[PDB]
Amino acid sequence: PFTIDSARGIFPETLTADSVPATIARFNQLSAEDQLALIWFAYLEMGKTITIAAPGAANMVFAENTLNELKQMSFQEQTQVMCDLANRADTPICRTYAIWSVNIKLGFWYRLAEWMEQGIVAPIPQGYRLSANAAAVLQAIRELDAGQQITVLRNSVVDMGYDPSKLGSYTKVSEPVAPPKEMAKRTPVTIEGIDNPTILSYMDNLNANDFDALIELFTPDGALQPPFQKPIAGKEAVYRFFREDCQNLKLIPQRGVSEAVEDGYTQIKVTGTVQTPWFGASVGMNMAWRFLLTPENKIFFVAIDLLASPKELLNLVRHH
Numbered sequence: 096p097f098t099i100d101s102a103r104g105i106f107p108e109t110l111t112a113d114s115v116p117a118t119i120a121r122f123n124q125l126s127a128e129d130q131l132a133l134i135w136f137a138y139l140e141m142g143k144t145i146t147i148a149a150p151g152a153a154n155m156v157f158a159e160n161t162l163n164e165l166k167q168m169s170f171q172e173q174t175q176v177m178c179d180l181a182n183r184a185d186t187p188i189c190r191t192y193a194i195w196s197v198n199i200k201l202g203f204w205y206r207l208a209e210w211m212e213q214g215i216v217a218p219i220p221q222g223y224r225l226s227a228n229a230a231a232v233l234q235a236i237r238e239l240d241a242g243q244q245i246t247v248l249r250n251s252v253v254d255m256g257y258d259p260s261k262l263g264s265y266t267k268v269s270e271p272v273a274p275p276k277e278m279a280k281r282t283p284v285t286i287e288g289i290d291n292p293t294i295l296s297y298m299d300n301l302n303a304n305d306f307d308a309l310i311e312l313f314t315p316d317g318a319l320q321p322p323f324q325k326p327i328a329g330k331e332a333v334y335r336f337f338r339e340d341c342q343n344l345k346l347i348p349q350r351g352v353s354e355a356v357e358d359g360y361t362q363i364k365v366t367g368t369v370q371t372p373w374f375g376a377s378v379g380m381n382m383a384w385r386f387l388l389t390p391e392n393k394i395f396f397v398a399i400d401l402l403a404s405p406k407e408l409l410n411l412v413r414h415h
Protein backbone atom coordinates (compact mmCIF):
# COMPACT_ATOMS: atom_id res chain seq x y z
CA PRO A 96 0.00 0.00 0.00
CA PHE A 97 1.71 3.23 1.12
CA THR A 98 5.43 3.13 1.84
CA ILE A 99 7.81 6.07 2.00
CA ASP A 100 8.94 5.24 -1.52
CA SER A 101 5.46 5.27 -3.01
CA ALA A 102 4.58 8.44 -1.04
CA ARG A 103 7.36 10.26 -2.89
CA GLY A 104 5.14 10.15 -6.00
CA ILE A 105 2.06 12.01 -4.73
CA PHE A 106 0.94 14.97 -6.86
CA PRO A 107 3.16 13.87 -9.78
CA GLU A 108 2.02 16.88 -11.87
CA THR A 109 4.20 19.03 -9.57
CA LEU A 110 7.01 20.33 -11.81
CA THR A 111 10.17 20.86 -9.75
CA ALA A 112 13.24 22.89 -10.72
CA ASP A 113 15.41 20.07 -11.91
CA SER A 114 17.53 22.66 -13.69
CA VAL A 115 19.26 22.94 -10.27
CA PRO A 116 20.70 19.40 -10.27
CA ALA A 117 21.22 19.69 -14.06
CA THR A 118 23.33 22.85 -13.62
CA ILE A 119 25.29 21.30 -10.74
CA ALA A 120 26.15 18.38 -12.98
CA ARG A 121 27.46 20.75 -15.65
CA PHE A 122 29.43 22.70 -13.02
CA ASN A 123 31.02 19.46 -11.75
CA GLN A 124 32.63 18.88 -15.20
CA LEU A 125 34.69 22.07 -14.89
CA SER A 126 38.21 22.62 -13.57
CA ALA A 127 38.60 23.82 -10.01
CA GLU A 128 39.93 27.15 -11.27
CA ASP A 129 36.94 27.65 -13.52
CA GLN A 130 34.54 26.64 -10.70
CA LEU A 131 36.00 29.30 -8.40
CA ALA A 132 35.98 31.95 -11.09
CA LEU A 133 32.46 31.07 -12.15
CA ILE A 134 31.06 31.29 -8.64
CA TRP A 135 32.92 34.59 -8.14
CA PHE A 136 31.33 36.11 -11.21
CA ALA A 137 27.88 34.70 -10.43
CA TYR A 138 27.98 35.95 -6.83
CA LEU A 139 29.16 39.41 -7.90
CA GLU A 140 26.30 39.72 -10.39
CA MET A 141 23.74 38.30 -7.95
CA GLY A 142 24.76 40.82 -5.33
CA LYS A 143 23.49 43.68 -7.45
CA THR A 144 19.88 42.65 -6.73
CA ILE A 145 19.88 40.29 -3.74
CA THR A 146 21.22 41.03 -0.27
CA ILE A 147 23.18 38.43 1.63
CA ALA A 148 23.12 38.58 5.44
CA ALA A 149 26.30 38.34 7.50
CA PRO A 150 27.01 35.13 9.43
CA GLY A 151 26.39 35.20 13.16
CA ALA A 152 29.12 35.16 15.79
CA ALA A 153 28.59 31.54 16.85
CA ASN A 154 28.63 30.37 13.24
CA MET A 155 32.06 31.81 12.76
CA VAL A 156 33.79 30.52 15.92
CA PHE A 157 34.04 27.08 14.31
CA ALA A 158 35.61 28.38 11.10
CA GLU A 159 37.91 30.87 12.83
CA ASN A 160 41.04 28.73 13.07
CA THR A 161 40.91 27.80 9.38
CA LEU A 162 40.20 31.40 8.32
CA ASN A 163 43.18 32.64 10.35
CA GLU A 164 45.40 30.02 8.68
CA LEU A 165 44.22 31.43 5.36
CA LYS A 166 44.60 35.09 6.41
CA GLN A 167 48.29 34.29 6.93
CA MET A 168 48.98 32.48 3.67
CA SER A 169 50.48 33.83 0.50
CA PHE A 170 48.04 34.66 -2.28
CA GLN A 171 49.37 31.58 -4.08
CA GLU A 172 48.80 29.30 -1.08
CA GLN A 173 45.30 30.72 -0.53
CA THR A 174 44.33 29.90 -4.14
CA GLN A 175 45.70 26.40 -3.72
CA VAL A 176 43.56 25.77 -0.62
CA MET A 177 40.49 26.97 -2.55
CA CYS A 178 41.29 24.62 -5.41
CA ASP A 179 41.80 21.80 -2.93
CA LEU A 180 38.31 22.47 -1.55
CA ALA A 181 36.75 22.51 -5.04
CA ASN A 182 38.60 19.32 -5.96
CA ARG A 183 37.52 17.55 -2.73
CA ALA A 184 41.20 16.84 -2.11
CA ASP A 185 42.53 14.99 0.95
CA THR A 186 44.17 17.79 2.93
CA PRO A 187 43.82 18.76 6.59
CA ILE A 188 41.70 21.81 5.70
CA CYS A 189 39.49 19.77 3.39
CA ARG A 190 39.01 17.22 6.20
CA THR A 191 38.14 19.95 8.68
CA TYR A 192 35.62 21.45 6.31
CA ALA A 193 34.02 18.11 5.65
CA ILE A 194 32.52 17.92 9.15
CA TRP A 195 31.01 21.40 9.21
CA SER A 196 27.32 22.01 8.95
CA VAL A 197 25.98 23.69 5.83
CA ASN A 198 25.70 27.08 7.50
CA ILE A 199 29.27 26.97 8.85
CA LYS A 200 30.62 26.20 5.34
CA LEU A 201 28.51 29.04 3.97
CA GLY A 202 29.86 31.47 6.53
CA PHE A 203 33.41 30.38 5.72
CA TRP A 204 32.89 31.25 2.06
CA TYR A 205 31.13 34.49 2.88
CA ARG A 206 34.23 35.59 4.76
CA LEU A 207 36.46 34.53 1.90
CA ALA A 208 34.23 36.51 -0.49
CA GLU A 209 34.74 39.64 1.66
CA TRP A 210 38.46 39.09 1.86
CA MET A 211 38.75 38.49 -1.88
CA GLU A 212 36.91 41.75 -2.52
CA GLN A 213 38.82 43.86 -0.04
CA GLY A 214 42.30 42.63 -0.81
CA ILE A 215 43.10 40.01 1.84
CA VAL A 216 42.61 36.81 -0.16
CA ALA A 217 43.90 36.17 -3.69
CA PRO A 218 41.34 37.53 -6.15
CA ILE A 219 40.27 35.81 -9.31
CA PRO A 220 43.04 36.85 -11.73
CA GLN A 221 42.27 39.93 -13.76
CA GLY A 222 41.36 38.94 -17.30
CA TYR A 223 40.67 35.37 -16.25
CA ARG A 224 39.21 33.41 -19.16
CA LEU A 225 36.59 30.76 -18.50
CA SER A 226 36.57 27.69 -20.67
CA ALA A 227 33.87 27.49 -23.31
CA ASN A 228 31.84 25.07 -21.18
CA ALA A 229 32.35 27.18 -18.02
CA ALA A 230 31.20 30.35 -19.81
CA ALA A 231 28.03 28.52 -20.82
CA VAL A 232 27.41 27.26 -17.27
CA LEU A 233 27.75 30.84 -15.95
CA GLN A 234 25.24 32.08 -18.49
CA ALA A 235 22.92 29.25 -17.55
CA ILE A 236 23.12 30.34 -13.87
CA ARG A 237 22.40 33.94 -14.87
CA GLU A 238 19.14 32.82 -16.53
CA LEU A 239 17.94 30.90 -13.47
CA ASP A 240 15.53 32.56 -11.07
CA ALA A 241 16.95 33.81 -7.81
CA GLY A 242 15.75 30.89 -5.72
CA GLN A 243 17.36 28.47 -8.18
CA GLN A 244 20.60 30.51 -8.24
CA ILE A 245 21.09 30.52 -4.47
CA THR A 246 20.31 26.75 -4.38
CA VAL A 247 23.06 26.11 -6.96
CA LEU A 248 25.51 28.29 -5.04
CA ARG A 249 24.73 26.58 -1.74
CA ASN A 250 25.06 23.12 -3.28
CA SER A 251 28.42 24.00 -4.75
CA VAL A 252 29.62 25.05 -1.26
CA VAL A 253 28.21 21.98 0.51
CA ASP A 254 29.93 19.60 -1.93
CA MET A 255 33.45 21.03 -1.43
CA GLY A 256 36.02 19.44 0.84
CA TYR A 257 36.83 15.85 1.51
CA ASP A 258 34.11 13.25 0.97
CA PRO A 259 32.60 12.87 4.44
CA SER A 260 31.64 9.29 3.50
CA LYS A 261 35.40 8.59 3.46
CA LEU A 262 35.91 9.81 7.06
CA GLY A 263 34.35 7.05 9.17
CA SER A 264 32.88 8.07 12.54
CA TYR A 265 33.02 11.75 13.23
CA THR A 266 31.37 14.49 15.26
CA LYS A 267 29.33 16.86 13.08
CA VAL A 268 30.01 20.46 14.07
CA SER A 269 26.88 22.64 14.12
CA GLU A 270 25.65 25.91 15.61
CA PRO A 271 23.83 25.99 18.94
CA VAL A 272 20.10 25.66 18.41
CA ALA A 273 18.06 28.83 18.66
CA PRO A 274 15.32 28.84 21.30
CA PRO A 275 11.68 28.53 20.28
CA LYS A 276 10.13 31.90 19.58
CA GLU A 277 7.73 32.86 22.41
CA MET A 278 4.28 31.50 21.65
CA ALA A 279 2.70 34.92 22.08
CA LYS A 280 4.96 36.59 19.51
CA ARG A 281 4.40 34.10 16.68
CA THR A 282 2.54 35.10 13.52
CA PRO A 283 0.38 32.12 12.44
CA VAL A 284 0.26 31.27 8.78
CA THR A 285 -2.92 31.27 6.70
CA ILE A 286 -3.45 28.86 3.81
CA GLU A 287 -6.31 29.30 1.37
CA GLY A 288 -8.13 26.03 0.96
CA ILE A 289 -6.52 24.33 3.98
CA ASP A 290 -7.45 24.34 7.65
CA ASN A 291 -5.91 21.01 8.65
CA PRO A 292 -4.39 21.59 12.08
CA THR A 293 -1.26 19.52 11.43
CA ILE A 294 -0.36 21.44 8.30
CA LEU A 295 -0.74 24.77 10.11
CA SER A 296 1.21 23.44 13.11
CA TYR A 297 4.02 22.31 10.85
CA MET A 298 4.34 25.72 9.27
CA ASP A 299 4.03 27.60 12.54
CA ASN A 300 6.39 25.47 14.60
CA LEU A 301 9.08 25.60 11.90
CA ASN A 302 8.64 29.41 11.69
CA ALA A 303 9.14 29.47 15.47
CA ASN A 304 12.19 27.22 15.59
CA ASP A 305 10.08 24.94 17.84
CA PHE A 306 11.52 21.63 16.72
CA ASP A 307 10.27 19.70 19.75
CA ALA A 308 6.66 20.45 18.86
CA LEU A 309 7.31 20.00 15.13
CA ILE A 310 8.70 16.51 15.51
CA GLU A 311 5.66 15.32 17.45
CA LEU A 312 3.61 15.90 14.32
CA PHE A 313 5.33 12.97 12.67
CA THR A 314 4.73 9.25 12.87
CA PRO A 315 7.65 7.38 14.48
CA ASP A 316 8.74 6.16 11.05
CA GLY A 317 7.69 9.35 9.23
CA ALA A 318 10.02 10.79 6.60
CA LEU A 319 10.91 14.24 5.23
CA GLN A 320 12.39 14.78 1.79
CA PRO A 321 14.20 18.07 1.17
CA PRO A 322 14.51 19.49 -2.37
CA PHE A 323 16.46 17.18 -4.71
CA GLN A 324 17.45 14.80 -1.89
CA LYS A 325 16.43 11.37 -0.68
CA PRO A 326 13.94 11.04 2.19
CA ILE A 327 15.27 11.46 5.73
CA ALA A 328 13.52 8.63 7.59
CA GLY A 329 12.40 8.43 11.21
CA LYS A 330 11.99 10.94 13.99
CA GLU A 331 15.62 10.60 15.17
CA ALA A 332 17.10 11.68 11.79
CA VAL A 333 14.37 14.20 10.96
CA TYR A 334 14.80 15.91 14.33
CA ARG A 335 18.56 16.19 13.77
CA PHE A 336 18.01 17.67 10.30
CA PHE A 337 15.65 20.21 11.78
CA ARG A 338 18.07 21.35 14.47
CA GLU A 339 21.13 21.27 12.20
CA ASP A 340 19.83 22.78 8.95
CA CYS A 341 16.41 24.37 9.42
CA GLN A 342 16.74 27.29 11.82
CA ASN A 343 15.42 30.77 11.14
CA LEU A 344 13.48 29.91 7.99
CA LYS A 345 10.39 31.91 7.09
CA LEU A 346 7.66 29.79 5.51
CA ILE A 347 5.01 31.83 3.70
CA PRO A 348 2.41 29.33 2.43
CA GLN A 349 -0.34 30.70 0.15
CA ARG A 350 -2.77 27.97 -0.91
CA GLY A 351 -3.40 24.25 -0.87
CA VAL A 352 -5.64 21.34 -1.61
CA SER A 353 -6.54 18.22 0.35
CA GLU A 354 -7.63 14.82 -0.97
CA ALA A 355 -8.75 11.72 0.84
CA VAL A 356 -7.04 8.63 -0.44
CA GLU A 357 -6.98 5.09 0.88
CA ASP A 358 -7.70 4.08 4.42
CA GLY A 359 -8.48 7.45 5.98
CA TYR A 360 -5.15 8.82 4.83
CA THR A 361 -5.11 12.23 3.24
CA GLN A 362 -2.65 13.76 0.78
CA ILE A 363 -2.22 17.57 0.94
CA LYS A 364 -0.33 19.92 -1.39
CA VAL A 365 0.56 23.47 -0.31
CA THR A 366 2.35 26.09 -2.42
CA GLY A 367 4.02 29.30 -1.32
CA THR A 368 7.38 30.87 -0.72
CA VAL A 369 10.24 30.32 1.68
CA GLN A 370 12.92 32.72 2.83
CA THR A 371 16.29 31.62 4.10
CA PRO A 372 18.01 33.74 6.78
CA TRP A 373 20.94 34.19 4.36
CA PHE A 374 18.88 36.48 2.06
CA GLY A 375 15.72 37.33 3.93
CA ALA A 376 13.05 38.91 1.83
CA SER A 377 15.45 39.56 -1.04
CA VAL A 378 14.96 35.98 -2.33
CA GLY A 379 11.62 34.27 -2.21
CA MET A 380 11.94 30.58 -3.20
CA ASN A 381 8.80 29.22 -4.82
CA MET A 382 8.07 25.99 -2.96
CA ALA A 383 5.55 23.15 -2.76
CA TRP A 384 4.92 20.91 0.22
CA ARG A 385 3.40 17.47 -0.43
CA PHE A 386 2.15 15.74 2.71
CA LEU A 387 0.73 12.26 3.36
CA LEU A 388 -1.23 12.25 6.64
CA THR A 389 -2.63 9.32 8.58
CA PRO A 390 -6.25 9.32 9.82
CA GLU A 391 -4.86 10.77 13.07
CA ASN A 392 -3.36 13.76 11.23
CA LYS A 393 0.20 12.51 11.73
CA ILE A 394 2.80 13.18 9.04
CA PHE A 395 3.82 9.90 7.43
CA PHE A 396 5.71 11.72 4.65
CA VAL A 397 6.33 15.27 3.60
CA ALA A 398 8.30 16.32 0.49
CA ILE A 399 9.47 19.87 0.02
CA ASP A 400 10.03 20.87 -3.61
CA LEU A 401 11.66 23.87 -5.29
CA LEU A 402 9.25 24.70 -8.12
CA ALA A 403 10.25 25.14 -11.76
CA SER A 404 8.51 28.52 -12.14
CA PRO A 405 5.87 30.70 -10.52
CA LYS A 406 3.09 29.10 -12.69
CA GLU A 407 3.46 26.05 -10.54
CA LEU A 408 2.25 27.96 -7.50
CA LEU A 409 -1.26 27.65 -8.90
CA ASN A 410 -0.96 23.97 -9.85
CA LEU A 411 -3.23 22.43 -7.20
CA VAL A 412 -5.02 19.36 -8.51
CA ARG A 413 -7.76 18.17 -6.14
CA HIS A 414 -8.66 14.79 -7.68
CA HIS A 415 -6.33 12.03 -8.86
Ligand SMILES: CC1=C(/C=C/C(C)=C/C=C/C(C)=C/C=C/C=C(C)/C=C/C=C(C)/C=C/C2=C(C)C(=O)CCC2(C)C)C(C)(C)CCC1=O
Nearest residue numbers: 131134135138201204205208245246248249321371373399
Ligand atom coordinates in the same frame (compact mmCIF):
# COMPACT_ATOMS: atom_id res chain seq x y z
C1 LIG B 1 31.99 29.38 -2.89
C2 LIG B 1 32.66 30.55 -3.60
C3 LIG B 1 32.41 31.91 -3.25
C4 LIG B 1 31.43 32.22 -2.31
C5 LIG B 1 30.15 31.84 -2.28
C6 LIG B 1 29.21 32.09 -1.38
C7 LIG B 1 29.58 32.98 -0.21
C8 LIG B 1 27.89 31.71 -1.51
C9 LIG B 1 26.89 31.84 -0.62
C10 LIG B 1 25.63 31.32 -0.79
C11 LIG B 1 24.55 31.22 0.06
C12 LIG B 1 24.62 31.86 1.40
C13 LIG B 1 23.43 30.50 -0.25
C14 LIG B 1 22.36 30.16 0.58
C15 LIG B 1 21.29 29.39 0.18
C16 LIG B 1 20.24 28.94 0.94
C17 LIG B 1 19.18 28.15 0.58
C18 LIG B 1 18.99 27.71 -0.88
C19 LIG B 1 18.26 27.66 1.45
C20 LIG B 1 17.12 26.97 1.21
C21 LIG B 1 16.33 26.42 2.20
C22 LIG B 1 15.13 25.78 2.07
C23 LIG B 1 14.52 25.63 0.68
C24 LIG B 1 14.49 25.14 3.11
C25 LIG B 1 13.27 24.54 3.12
C26 LIG B 1 12.67 23.75 4.10
C27 LIG B 1 11.27 23.82 4.29
C28 LIG B 1 10.43 24.88 3.73
C29 LIG B 1 10.59 22.80 5.06
O1 LIG B 1 9.29 22.82 5.14
C30 LIG B 1 11.27 21.70 5.75
C31 LIG B 1 12.73 22.06 5.94
C32 LIG B 1 13.37 22.51 4.64
C33 LIG B 1 14.91 22.69 4.99
C34 LIG B 1 13.33 21.32 3.66
C35 LIG B 1 33.27 33.05 -3.80
C36 LIG B 1 32.46 34.27 -4.04
C37 LIG B 1 34.36 33.44 -2.77
C38 LIG B 1 33.92 32.55 -5.11
C39 LIG B 1 34.63 31.27 -4.98
C40 LIG B 1 33.69 30.18 -4.52
O2 LIG B 1 33.87 29.04 -4.93
